Design a protein around this motif. Structure first.
Motif, PDB file in Angstrom:
ATOM      1  N   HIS A 165       0.822  -1.234   0.000  1.00 33.99           N
ATOM      2  CA  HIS A 165       0.000   0.000   0.000  1.00 33.99           C
ATOM      3  C   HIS A 165       0.831   1.248   0.000  1.00 33.99           C
ATOM      4  O   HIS A 165       0.501   2.203  -0.685  1.00 33.99           O
ATOM      5  N   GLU A 166       1.935   1.232   0.739  1.00 33.90           N
ATOM      6  CA  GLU A 166       2.935   2.300   0.671  1.00 33.90           C
ATOM      7  C   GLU A 166       3.433   2.582  -0.737  1.00 33.90           C
ATOM      8  O   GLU A 166       3.952   3.658  -0.997  1.00 33.90           O
ATOM      9  N   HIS A 167       3.320   1.608  -1.633  1.00 36.11           N
ATOM     10  CA  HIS A 167       3.813   1.801  -2.987  1.00 36.11           C
ATOM     11  C   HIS A 167       2.675   2.033  -3.916  1.00 36.11           C
ATOM     12  O   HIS A 167       2.847   1.972  -5.131  1.00 36.11           O
ATOM     13  N   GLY A 168       1.476   2.198  -3.364  1.00 30.00           N
ATOM     14  CA  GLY A 168       0.310   2.423  -4.213  1.00 30.00           C
ATOM     15  C   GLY A 168      -0.226   1.179  -4.897  1.00 30.00           C
ATOM     16  O   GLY A 168      -0.958   1.282  -5.871  1.00 30.00           O
ATOM     17  N   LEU A 169       0.064  -0.003  -4.346  1.00 22.97           N
ATOM     18  CA  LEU A 169      -0.328  -1.239  -5.020  1.00 22.97           C
ATOM     19  C   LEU A 169      -1.215  -2.136  -4.168  1.00 22.97           C
ATOM     20  O   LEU A 169      -1.127  -2.116  -2.951  1.00 22.97           O
ATOM     21  N   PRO A 170      -2.136  -2.879  -4.802  1.00 25.48           N
ATOM     22  CA  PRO A 170      -2.911  -3.882  -4.062  1.00 25.48           C
ATOM     23  C   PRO A 170      -2.076  -5.133  -3.730  1.00 25.48           C
ATOM     24  O   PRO A 170      -1.277  -5.558  -4.547  1.00 25.48           O
ATOM     25  N   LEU A 171      -2.341  -5.788  -2.602  1.00 28.98           N
ATOM     26  CA  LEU A 171      -1.753  -7.110  -2.347  1.00 28.98           C
ATOM     27  C   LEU A 171      -2.657  -8.222  -2.833  1.00 28.98           C
ATOM     28  O   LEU A 171      -3.882  -8.180  -2.620  1.00 28.98           O
ATOM     29  N   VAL A 172      -2.054  -9.208  -3.499  1.00 28.11           N
ATOM     30  CA  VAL A 172      -2.777 -10.325  -4.082  1.00 28.11           C
ATOM     31  C   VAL A 172      -2.299 -11.643  -3.459  1.00 28.11           C
ATOM     32  O   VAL A 172      -1.087 -11.907  -3.375  1.00 28.11           O
ATOM     33  N   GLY A 173      -3.241 -12.410  -2.908  1.00 29.26           N
ATOM     34  CA  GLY A 173      -2.928 -13.678  -2.242  1.00 29.26           C
ATOM     35  C   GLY A 173      -4.189 -14.499  -1.983  1.00 29.26           C
ATOM     36  O   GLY A 173      -5.286 -14.136  -2.465  1.00 29.26           O
ATOM     37  N   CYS A 174      -4.041 -15.604  -1.238  1.00 33.57           N
ATOM     38  CA  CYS A 174      -5.139 -16.529  -1.019  1.00 33.57           C
ATOM     39  C   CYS A 174      -5.872 -16.335   0.319  1.00 33.57           C
ATOM     40  O   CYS A 174      -6.864 -16.992   0.551  1.00 33.57           O
ATOM     41  N   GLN A 175      -5.435 -15.396   1.156  1.00 24.20           N
ATOM     42  CA  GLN A 175      -5.801 -15.409   2.572  1.00 24.20           C
ATOM     43  C   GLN A 175      -6.326 -14.072   3.087  1.00 24.20           C
ATOM     44  O   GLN A 175      -6.078 -13.025   2.488  1.00 24.20           O
ATOM     45  N   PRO A 176      -6.957 -14.091   4.281  1.00 23.58           N
ATOM     46  CA  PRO A 176      -7.395 -12.819   4.836  1.00 23.58           C
ATOM     47  C   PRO A 176      -6.217 -11.891   5.058  1.00 23.58           C
ATOM     48  O   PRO A 176      -5.169 -12.300   5.598  1.00 23.58           O
ATOM     49  N   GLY A 177      -6.457 -10.622   4.779  1.00 27.29           N
ATOM     50  CA  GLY A 177      -5.439  -9.594   4.849  1.00 27.29           C
ATOM     51  C   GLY A 177      -5.027  -9.074   3.469  1.00 27.29           C
ATOM     52  O   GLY A 177      -4.505  -7.981   3.372  1.00 27.29           O
ATOM     53  N   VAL A 178      -5.214  -9.855   2.401  1.00 23.23           N
ATOM     54  CA  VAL A 178      -4.909  -9.323   1.055  1.00 23.23           C
ATOM     55  C   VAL A 178      -6.030  -8.410   0.528  1.00 23.23           C
ATOM     56  O   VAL A 178      -7.106  -8.361   1.119  1.00 23.23           O
ATOM     57  N   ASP A 179      -5.798  -7.737  -0.601  1.00 27.41           N
ATOM     58  CA  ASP A 179      -6.835  -6.921  -1.238  1.00 27.41           C
ATOM     59  C   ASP A 179      -7.656  -7.688  -2.267  1.00 27.41           C
ATOM     60  O   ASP A 179      -8.868  -7.561  -2.288  1.00 27.41           O
ATOM     61  N   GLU A 180      -7.010  -8.505  -3.096  1.00 24.52           N
ATOM     62  CA  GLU A 180      -7.734  -9.392  -4.000  1.00 24.52           C
ATOM     63  C   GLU A 180      -7.339 -10.829  -3.732  1.00 24.52           C
ATOM     64  O   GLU A 180      -6.155 -11.159  -3.635  1.00 24.52           O
ATOM     65  N   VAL A 181      -8.344 -11.680  -3.572  1.00 22.90           N
ATOM     66  CA  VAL A 181      -8.111 -13.014  -3.084  1.00 22.90           C
ATOM     67  C   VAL A 181      -8.169 -13.932  -4.270  1.00 22.90           C
ATOM     68  O   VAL A 181      -9.069 -13.800  -5.106  1.00 22.90           O
ATOM     69  N   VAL A 182      -7.147 -14.780  -4.408  1.00 30.01           N
ATOM     70  CA  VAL A 182      -7.078 -15.718  -5.521  1.00 30.01           C
ATOM     71  C   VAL A 182      -6.850 -17.119  -4.951  1.00 30.01           C
ATOM     72  O   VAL A 182      -5.891 -17.334  -4.210  1.00 30.01           O
ATOM     73  N   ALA A 183      -7.698 -18.084  -5.311  1.00 35.78           N
ATOM     74  CA  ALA A 183      -7.573 -19.423  -4.715  1.00 35.78           C
ATOM     75  C   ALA A 183      -6.422 -20.179  -5.374  1.00 35.78           C
ATOM     76  O   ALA A 183      -5.901 -21.147  -4.824  1.00 35.78           O
ATOM     77  N   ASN A 184      -6.108 -19.816  -6.609  1.00 32.71           N
ATOM     78  CA  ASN A 184      -5.165 -20.601  -7.389  1.00 32.71           C
ATOM     79  C   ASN A 184      -4.513 -19.781  -8.508  1.00 32.71           C
ATOM     80  O   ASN A 184      -4.964 -18.669  -8.831  1.00 32.71           O
ATOM     81  N   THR A 185      -3.576 -20.397  -9.226  1.00 31.66           N
ATOM     82  CA  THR A 185      -2.806 -19.636 -10.200  1.00 31.66           C
ATOM     83  C   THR A 185      -3.611 -19.247 -11.424  1.00 31.66           C
ATOM     84  O   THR A 185      -3.408 -18.147 -11.942  1.00 31.66           O
ATOM     85  N   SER A 186      -4.618 -20.053 -11.798  1.00 31.38           N
ATOM     86  CA  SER A 186      -5.509 -19.664 -12.927  1.00 31.38           C
ATOM     87  C   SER A 186      -6.235 -18.400 -12.594  1.00 31.38           C
ATOM     88  O   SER A 186      -6.393 -17.512 -13.428  1.00 31.38           O
ATOM     89  N   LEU A 187      -6.792 -18.363 -11.391  1.00 36.72           N
ATOM     90  CA  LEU A 187      -7.494 -17.170 -11.001  1.00 36.72           C
ATOM     91  C   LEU A 187      -6.556 -15.967 -10.970  1.00 36.72           C
ATOM     92  O   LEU A 187      -6.929 -14.879 -11.426  1.00 36.72           O
ATOM     93  N   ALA A 188      -5.323 -16.161 -10.482  1.00 35.34           N
ATOM     94  CA  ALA A 188      -4.357 -15.027 -10.419  1.00 35.34           C
ATOM     95  C   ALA A 188      -3.952 -14.625 -11.847  1.00 35.34           C
ATOM     96  O   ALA A 188      -3.813 -13.438 -12.167  1.00 35.34           O
ATOM     97  N   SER A 189      -3.856 -15.605 -12.736  1.00 35.20           N
ATOM     98  CA  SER A 189      -3.581 -15.286 -14.123  1.00 35.20           C
ATOM     99  C   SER A 189      -4.744 -14.478 -14.721  1.00 35.20           C
ATOM    100  O   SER A 189      -4.549 -13.487 -15.459  1.00 35.20           O
ATOM    101  N   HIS A 190      -5.964 -14.915 -14.406  1.00 33.82           N
ATOM    102  CA  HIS A 190      -7.140 -14.291 -14.963  1.00 33.82           C
ATOM    103  C   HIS A 190      -7.279 -12.904 -14.386  1.00 33.82           C
ATOM    104  O   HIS A 190      -7.599 -11.939 -15.096  1.00 33.82           O
TER     105      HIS A 190
END
Ligand SMILES: [Mg+2]
Length: 202
Positions: A165-190
């Motif tokens: 957030h300090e860099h103006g960017l969203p965090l992307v991951g599978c767990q609580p605390g991220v901004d966009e939640v992705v269960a798997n690599t296809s979803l992160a690719s998409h």
């Protein structure tokens, strides 16, 4: 765990900043820092991972090489081997001060050891499988399961999110605390190909 006292101290550990033209492709991931001398306190920062082997650009404490599985590429500045294959390219993980709107990346040298633990895996999997051009304006963090698709939670997510957030960017991951939640690599690719979370309008 977030200490703004520890972040400021080890800010003088940052030296030799420079601005580079845009890499052909890259990915951004967070790294969580602790000192032994300060139990309880942590701060995050960001790495941008770009094509090419450039150990000379790293502080000597980060000049270690990790391998993808079966001799299929490597990454400088990462401290542990990567349990899936790469795309036959060696990469270098550079400390990222700023990624600019034109694509330029401002990078720096930092007096610190390499990125440890498995949280770099999600960004690396995407870099070698899914990203062909440009650097997604997102910070990826997550371990990759033995099936090579499922993302597994990591430590220090809130520290990573603050660094993102300090860099103006969203965090992307599978767990609580991220901004966009992705269960798997296809979803992160998409997510990457979409440019943002797809929007639903009722
Ligand atoms: Mg971890």
């Amino acid at each position: 765990r977030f200490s703004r006292n520890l972040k400021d101290r080890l800010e003088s550990n940052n030296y030799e900043e420079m601005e580079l033209p845009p890499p052909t492709k890259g990915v951004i991931i967070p790294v969580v820092h602790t000192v032994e001398s300060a139990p309880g306190e942590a701060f995050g920062s960001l790495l941008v991972i770009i094509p090419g082997a450039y150990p000379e650009l790293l502080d000597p404490n980060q000049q270690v090489l990790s391998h993808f599985k079966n001799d299929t590429g490597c990454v400088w500045g990462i401290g542990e081997d990567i349990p899936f294959e790469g795309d036959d390219i060696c990469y270098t993980a550079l400390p990222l001060k700023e990624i600019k709107k034109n694509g330029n990346i401002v990078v720096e040298k930092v007096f610190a050891g390499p990125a440890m633990g498995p949280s770099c895996q999600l960004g690396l999997s995407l870099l070698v499988n899914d990203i062909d051009k440009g650097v997604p304006r997102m910070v990826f963090t997550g371990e990759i399961a033995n099936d090579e698709e499922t993302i597994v939670p990591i430590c220090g997510v809130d520290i990573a999110a603050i660094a993102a957030h300090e860099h103006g960017l969203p965090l992307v991951g599978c767990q609580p605390g991220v901004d966009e939640v992705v269960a798997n690599t296809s979803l992160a690719s998409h997510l990457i190909q979409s440019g943002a979370l797809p929007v639903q309008k009722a």
